């Protein structure tokens, strides 16, 4: 019914009503970075992701 990967982590499960394979892929990963080239000159920033 279930199954792990090479990293020894449960992240796969077989559909009992479809006989298919549906992997688990979360969408919550990364960080938020801010670019501030000195506040004494300008007052503009840049949203940087990961």
């Amino acid at each position: 019914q279930f199954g792990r990967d090479i990293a020894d982590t449960t992240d796969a499960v077989r559909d009992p009503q479809t006989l298919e394979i549906l992997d688990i892929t979360p969408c919550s990963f990364g960080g938020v970075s801010v670019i501030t080239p000195g506040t004494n000159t300008s007052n503009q920033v840049a949203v940087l992701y990961q």
Binding site: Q1, F2, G3, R4, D5, I6, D8, T10, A12, R14
Partner: protein
């Protein structure tokens, strides 16, 4: 009460290996503590010829 042959004792190996759980594993080694048959074990050999 009739005649009968006495049982014997043999040796078995590379047997008694099954899936300990229902978890799919591929290209990964795993070692668990479950009941299995040890290699080169003396068992009782029965007959019925």
């Amino acid at each position: 009460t009739r005649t009968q042959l006495p049982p014997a004792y043999t040796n078995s190996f590379t047997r008694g290996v099954y899936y300990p759980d229902k978890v799919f594993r591929s290209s990964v080694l795993h070692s668990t503590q479950d009941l299995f048959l040890p290699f080169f074990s003396n068992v009782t050999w029965f007959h019925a010829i």
